[PDB]
Design a protein around this nucleic acid. Structure first.
Length: 137
DNA sequence: CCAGCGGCAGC
DNA sequence: GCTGCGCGCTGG
């Protein structure tokens, strides 16, 4: 299973090989415009390239990086918690993990696994992709 | 100028 | 279902 490249340009299309990066991408996109989030996502992934490093991060430092995005302290605490569980808990679907809900589960089930047919997403840029999947099928 | 709008936990 | 978190994008 390889999710196809779409005319919609979801960030999920580039990060599916590393689930952690793709899931962090969804967290950056919680009620935050893609325009601001994605640039700042790359900035994060240079300072914190893995779940192994983010897990030892000081949430307060992670928060200074997020300031322009909003929900900066909430999401910072979230990035240090999720990354910890991601490597420490046994999980099948990321929904089990702190900070990941329907949206992040929907992205993982489409891009990181062959389960797109079984998914009913709600997030806007995601339904455009998912419908495009059924349409081009 | 300006106000509406781009998920999650925890109760 | 309800509520707090939060900035800047956009478009009249």
């Amino acid at each position: 299973w390889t999710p196809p490249r779409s005319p919609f340009n979801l960030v999920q299309e580039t990060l599916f090989h590393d689930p952690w990066k793709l899931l962090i991408a969804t967290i950056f996109l919680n009620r935050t415009s893609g325009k601001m989030a994605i640039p700042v996502l790359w900035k994060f992934l240079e300072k914190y390239p893995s779940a192994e490093v983010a897990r030892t991060a000081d949430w307060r430092d992670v928060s200074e990086l997020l300031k322009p995005l909003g929900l900066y302290d909430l999401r910072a605490k979230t990035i240090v918690k999720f990354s910890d569980e991601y490597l420490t808990k046994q999980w099948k679907y990321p929904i089990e993990l702190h900070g990941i809900g329907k949206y992040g589960n929907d992205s993982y089930r489409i891009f990181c696994v062959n389960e797109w047919k079984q998914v009913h997403p709600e997030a806007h840029k995601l339904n455009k992709y998912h419908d495009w999947l059924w349409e081009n099928h």
